[PDB]
Every structure is written in structure tokens, then in C-alpha cells.
Amino acid sequence: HPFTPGMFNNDPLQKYDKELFDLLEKEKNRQIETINLIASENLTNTAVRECLGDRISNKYSEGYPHKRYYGGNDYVDKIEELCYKRALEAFNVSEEEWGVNVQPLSGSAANVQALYALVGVKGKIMGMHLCSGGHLTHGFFDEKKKVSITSDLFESKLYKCNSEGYVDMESVRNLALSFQPKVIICGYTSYPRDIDYKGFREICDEVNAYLFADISHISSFVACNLLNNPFTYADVVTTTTHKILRGPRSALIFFNKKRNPGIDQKINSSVFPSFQGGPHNNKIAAVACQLKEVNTPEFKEYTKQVLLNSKALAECLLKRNLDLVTNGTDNHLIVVDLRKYNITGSKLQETCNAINIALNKNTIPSDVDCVSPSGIRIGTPALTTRGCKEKDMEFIADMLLKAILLTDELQQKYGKKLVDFKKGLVNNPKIDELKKEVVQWAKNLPFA
Amino acid sequence: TPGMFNNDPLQKYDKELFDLLEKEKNRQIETINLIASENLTNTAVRECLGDRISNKYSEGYPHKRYYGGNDYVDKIEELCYKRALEAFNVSEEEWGVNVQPLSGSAANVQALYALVGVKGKIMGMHLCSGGHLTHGFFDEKKKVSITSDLFESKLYKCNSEGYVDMESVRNLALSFQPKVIICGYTSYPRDIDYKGFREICDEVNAYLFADISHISSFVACNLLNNPFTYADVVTTTTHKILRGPRSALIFFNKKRNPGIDQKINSSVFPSFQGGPHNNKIAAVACQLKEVNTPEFKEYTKQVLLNSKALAECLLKRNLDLVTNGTDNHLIVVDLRKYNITGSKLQETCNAINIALNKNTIPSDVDCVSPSGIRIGTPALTTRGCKEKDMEFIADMLLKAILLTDELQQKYGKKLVDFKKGLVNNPKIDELKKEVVQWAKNLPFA
Ligand SMILES: *Cc1c(COP(=O)(O)O)cnc(C)c1O
Ligand SMILES: *Cc1c(COP(=O)(O)O)cnc(C)c1O
């Protein structure tokens, strides 16, 4: 019948919206010429972005496969099922003992959700403090203000690292007896060592508690058997599919069924309908795409390289006498203790930003005040993806150091007020010279 | 020194997944979609969703970030703010917006939390009358939605005609003493008396909360009552009728309540979320530019004109509708006339490539064996359907309704049996063919 055109515009973003296209293309390029040392950032590849852009996100699909509110969910169903399967395979667990939910929109969501399923409203949860390397959704609150809902929706007590920066199993086991919570969370944001799960598993049993393991930072190591495996001990294991796993921004919630029969029911309800509506099927498709990469030799070889680059960088840094929290690293992350140079993480953070090196201020055990953090963290997953090898860590080390020394210098010339110091970065030529060296080093590396 | 990543295309890298995805696209092409909460994204939005900006962690707000390297992220979040306020014609001295909530349901738990806090009292419309799960909905078996557990909730209802009961809204409000009143709904075919609610709110010093997810595009284009003039918070999903990606927006009236900005913006982060999804913010920003064009006003017009057109055809064919018509993109048919269930017709229609969903009617007390169905015109409109085509749609439903009565008589009243009828049936095989040829024919974004 006589043609009437759709009411849409399928032209490219370049033609259709020049303003946005330009801003985005400036980001892709800023990315290329930056040395990304943010332990939680990574680069997605073609396949994953292709899924994220897939039309499958048109489909509303509240419910779980074969139990959906709307119809027309056969290919959605097959895809979510393929996702469960790749997820289980990726971590060597079996559908009999373990099940998984792939509908959470991010990690924080996965966490609140899995927590609530376990504990309910004003239930008792226990996790590591933030400044010591816990995540906000581990029950963080500070002073009067309950900062994370996990602190307000639940009763949360926080444990801490000792002075050497390790988790104090004794202090853990204490609070466990004292506060007596219903769930103990481990898995951490910025902890440079492996986690003693056997340990936590026992403390949990003494107190008859749930053992909750957040591997968002180190998911790939677990998968590749390069760290302890929490899946031996834990009742619930969640992870972001981004960061070290190099997938889309989404999350997983794995649950131990043999340890808690009908826990699946509890987890699923919390995700939908307690917390969420329709899933984001492109996220799901994208996550299935990456989990297949994960169960791969090339991905195993990438994971190990991340570990090898990190430890290599630690050597380089210790060789230059820098003081590292816990004095090394079992993983992709490292925290530098900066107080020896009379400089704050904050200051160094701005110095590195100004020379196209991205990292972030961190806390050393001895900073009681999270106000003025005295360290920084750095991670190798982004550089490793971009092809850096162990020998390439020498250069990173030399630069950080150069950056540390330039921080003291300006600090004094312009003052120890962040506002003042910050202005020493604006018109400095010693900074344009480092940025140049950096930008050229970075532009050269492969980019996904 | 080769990078340690495989940039191969999805076809090559993961043919299994690629296949399923393709099968998905063609299922969409060959389906007459009447699901009132589905639409189609266009090339640019999806380009944005795949954009690498998602690689970047932007915990915090523009110029208030934790990490450095957020210059363009900031430009873009701000651009999103700008195009957002602009889309709904409100002003940045009067109104603020938060573009970080990852979905509609999140936008709602966050906003609510920001306004009332733990165990605060909220009042919303009952699911079965068209309130969303996030509007405080609880069963008496369970607290189905977290919104019923984390907050104290009371559900209001609609009357036997299907209209919101303004007096019942106002009785419950005086008895309950809630701090937030929610209006804006999932399967309600008329416009909302925001002014009525603003009155019933003051009289109890509650916040008027408008969730305009289903009808967002109309409000923007002034084809429906504007909640902006009377509400304290407005939430919407940028998908559905607004046709953007899957994300949400919270809009807040500063002038009505100063310092509201901190409460909303803290609720989103760090109370609830973490790193935003910068692809999503981008694609929202992309789509809010389209909303503010003649072409998209011309679109919303058609969605509406097609809806009313379809209600006319259905009414001529003597179907019964809640409220006897629609003021928007949605229509709910009362199926009792045919002694048929929404489930059964849902099933019949899937079998013949027509998507639509069962919906309860004021007579019903349950979410199971509901007596009606819901249909909406946003997607067919996008695909270039006009008023003349609602006649095809109407006959086709009428056929389905008939074939449902028929199969019920033959195969049995229990759904399990009935589902059995739809398999290898040539009257169905034939309708499917009719529908596929028609649908396959239309534009597809
Ligand atoms: C980053 C992180 C999260 C939450 O990530 P989102 O940004 O909310 O997706 C949860 N747990 C850990 C350990 C994390 O590092
Ligand atoms: C669909 C809907 C929501 C929730 O959106 P999701 O993206 O599915 O979480 C909230 N409110 C209304 C009115 C809706 O129609």
C-alpha cells in the first residue's frame, strides 16, 4: 500500500547530532593519549559494544526465562540461559550446586539486592571499612550520616585492616562474636592481597552467618585460578562484569544452593520484582559475549599478564625505595604510601591528571581521617589490555617518581593548600614536558 | 607489541550469540507490537550505547568527581541536564534533574528514599488499577516491592469505571498522613488531575510525585496535562514512549523545596549507585535532543491519533473498554463480554505474532486470570502506521477474540489445555501468515 515513512531518523550520530558526536570523539581520543592506571577501569572490545548497541534492548522482559510476564521472549530466554551457562562455566561451578542471576544493572545494585535477600530490612551485615578498602555497599556509614543505603537499610558494623594493611582476622572474628551479624562480606575495592576465605568461612560458622564474597576487582584471577577461590567457601559471590573482567557495566550474583536450598528463590525475588523492573537485555547479551571470552586461553593469558605487569611494577617501585602498603601485591592493584615524601594523594592525583596519567588517591592504614588521604592506588588491567608488558613497568615507575618529586616542588613554591598548589599546574612548563612524553608514549599503544 | 584483546566482529567472535541476536531482530520485524511500554531506538541512540565512554568511571557529579579525566564526561552529563530541562520546558532556576538512575524502578526507589527516608510513608496507586510496582505495591502474602518494605505504603484505587478515585485518594491521604503521593501510572488510559493531587497534598503537607514514564512524550509536547506545574518530583524513564535508551530521569522543584537538590543527588549516589553508565547518559542526551523537534512532536501526535483511532474501531466493533476510550497511547479492553481471559488472548495473539499483554480490570481482585488486555500505539506509530491502519489491527483482534472463544469451547477452560490448542492449528497458521506479511512490510528502525 502507498508508502508512508517511519517516524524516525536513522542517520549517524555525526550527521544527526554533531554536538554530541564531537564530545564523544574527544573522549575516545583523550582515552588514547592517557596512561590509565585506574585499577577499576578497562577497555571493552568490538563484540561487547556491538551487543550493547543491539536492538534486543527494545524488548521488555520482566520475569525469568519461561516465567515471563509478556510474550515473545524465546530469543531473550535463549540468550539469558546462554548467559547462566557461560557464567557458571567461567568459574568452574556446576548448575547442581550453584546458580546465578544476571539481571543486576551494576555492582552496587547486585550487592544491595543480594544483601537484602539474605538479611531483610534492618538486618545485620558486616564488612570492611571504606578507607581500608571496602566498598560503599558493604555497609559504609560515617559519623552521623549513613552514606550507603547498605548502612541505612541494614544494621552494619565495619571491620578494619591492621597497620601493615592486612585484614585482621582476629578483629574480624571479634566483631563477629560481638556484633553478631547475619552476613560477613569480603572481597574488596583496594586491597592489594588475596583474601583468606577458609578463615572467613570459619568465623561465619561460629556465628552461623552467611559468607558473602565480592570479587568485582579480582574476578578474572578467580576464574583463572590465580587467586584463592571463594566459590569453595562462600554462600553468595557477586561480581561486576566490568573492571578486570572487561565486560559491559553490569553485574552477576552467584548463589550456593547446596549450602542453602531455595536460596535461588530468595535471590531472584530481590532482583525482580523487589528491586528492579525490566532487565537490560543488551547488557545481558553483552555479558554473555564476554563470559565466553573469559573461558578462553587468550583471556587466561591476558589475566596472567595483568598479574605479571602488576608485580613487575611493584618491584620497580620498591627498587626505587617507594613504600607500598603491605609492601607488595598479590594482584593487579598496589597502594603507595606517600607520607615519606610529605605529599598527599590528592596532590599527586592532580599532578598526574595534569600529565595525562590517571590514578587516584588512596588511604594508608594510619589515615584516621578519610579527609586527607596519604596514598594512591594503581592497577594494571587497562595498560595490560593495551599491550604493555613487564618491561614497560620501568617507564611507569620512573614517571610516577618524577611526578612525586614534581609534587613536592610545586607544593612548596605555591603552598600546601590544594587550591594554591593546584594553580602551580596551570602555567608550568615542567608539566607540559611530562605531558608531552606521556601523550606520545600513550598514543603509541594499541587501543580497543 | 600487539594489544591483548580481540576486536573481531560479533559474527566471527561469537556466532552463537550473533545468531540468537539476529533471530531476535527478525522476530521484531515480523511482529505487530502492541505492547504499550515498548518502542524502537534509532541508529544514533544505539551508537551511543556502544560508545567507549562507558569505559570511564565517573563516580560523583560534574566538577565534583572522585577521579580525574572527566572533562568530556562532565560536558556530556551537563549537556544531558540542559537538553532534559529544555525537553520538558522548565527552568534551571526552578528545576533540577538527575540523569544517573539506571532504570525507571531505580529512579523511583532513589527519589522516594531521598524524600522520606527509611520507613517513610508513601501513598501510590494499586498495581491492579495501574500503579507501578515501585509505587509501594504489596500483596498480603508478601511485601512484593522493596518500596513496600523500605517505606510504609498505602495503595489507593480506581472506581468501577476505571477512573482514579479523587475522593478516595483524599480520604486515605487524611487518614494515612503520607509524605509523598505518587500519581502517574502503567496502564491508565486517561489524563491525571495533577491540580487535584496538588490540593490533596498541601492539605496533608505531602510531596506530589509524578511518574510520567508511559506518557512522558505527551507532557513534553503539551498534548497532556503537565505535572511540572504542580509537582515536587517528576520521574520518567527515557525509554518507552519517549523512545530513548533504557535509563531514567529524576526532576526536582527547587523553588517548591530548597535544598532538595542535595537529597536527590545524594540518594542516587552514594546512597544507592556507584559509577554511572556514561553510554546511557550520552544516549539519553542524544534522544532528548530529538524530543525537542517538530518531527518528534509530529510523532507524539500520531501516537495519540492512532490510539484514539484504534479505540474508535474497537468501539464500533462493540468491544468494551475501561473508561470507554483513551486519552493517550493506551487502551484496556474489558474481555468479560466474551467470557475469555487476558491470558488466553495473550497466548492466542503470540501464536499469531501479535504482542500485547493481559491487564486487570476494575472487577478483578487478582493478578492471575485477569479479565482484560492492554494495547498501545507508540511502536506501530514509529513504524509508520497511521489512523487508517488501526482498522486492520481491530479486525485482527476481533478474529483473535473469536478464535479464543472457539478454542476454549474445544480444548478446555484451564490455560494448560488451551495452550495445547494453539499448536499445529491451521486457522492460526493462517493468521500468522497474514500478520507476518503485514508487519514485515512496515519500516523498522
Ligand atoms: C566498583 C565495585 C562495586 C560496584 O560497582 P558499580 O560501579 O556500582 O557497578 C561493587 N563491589 C566492588 C568490590 C567494586 O569495586
Ligand atoms: C515501566 C515503568 C517503570 C520502571 O521502569 P524500568 O526501566 O522497567 O525499571 C516505572 N514507572 C512506570 C510508570 C513505568 O511504566
Residue numbers in the entry:
A (entry chain A): -5 to 442
B (entry chain B): -2 to 442
Provide passages from the article that reported this PDB entry:
Serine hydroxymethyltransferase (SHMT), a ubiquitous pyridoxal-5′-phosphate (PLP)-dependent enzyme that catalyzes the interconversion of serine and tetrahydrofolate (THF) to glycine and 5,10-methylenetetrahydrofolate (MTHF), is one of the three enzymes in the dTMP cycle. Plasmodium falciparum serine hydroxymethyltransferase (PfSHMT), an enzyme in the dTMP synthesis cycle, is an antimalarial target because inhibition of its expression or function has been shown to be lethal to the parasite. Unlike hSHMT and rabbit SHMT (rSHMT), which exist as tetramers, the active form of PfSHMT is a homodimer with a molecular weight of about 85 kDa, similar to bacterial enzymes such as EcSHMT and Bacillus stearo­thermophilus (Bs) SHMT. Although the overall structure of PfSHMT is similar to those of other SHMTs, unique features including the presence of two loops and a distinctive cysteine pair formed by Cys125 and Cys364 in the tetrahydrofolate (THF) substrate binding pocket were identified.
As the wild-type enzyme could not be crystallized, protein engineering of residues on the surface was carried out. The surface-engineered mutant PfSHMT-F292E was successfully crystallized and its structure was determined at 3 Å resolution. The PfSHMT-F292E variant exhibited similar kinetic properties to those of the wild-type protein, indicating that the change to a hydrophilic residue only affected the surface properties and did not have a significant effect on the catalytic activity of the enzyme. The structure of PfSHMT was determined at 3 Å resolution in space group P61 with four protomers per asymmetric unit. The pyridoxal ring binds deeply in the pocket, with the C4A aldehyde of the pyridine ring forming a Schiff-base linkage to Lys237 N∊. Although the crystals of PfSHMT were grown from a solution of the enzyme in the presence of PLP and l-serine, the latter was not observed in the structure, likely owing to its high dissociation constant. Structural analysis of PfSHMT reveals a unique feature: Cys125 and Cys364 are present as a disulfide bond in one subunit and as cysteines with sulfhydryls in another subunit. A comparison of the local conformations of Cys125 and Cys364 in the four protomers showed that the Cα—Cα distances of the oxidized Cys364 from protomer A to the reduced states in the other three protomers are about 1.8–2.2 Å, while the Cys125 conformations are nearly identical. The presence of the disulfide bond in PfSHMT prevents the loop movement which is required for THF binding.
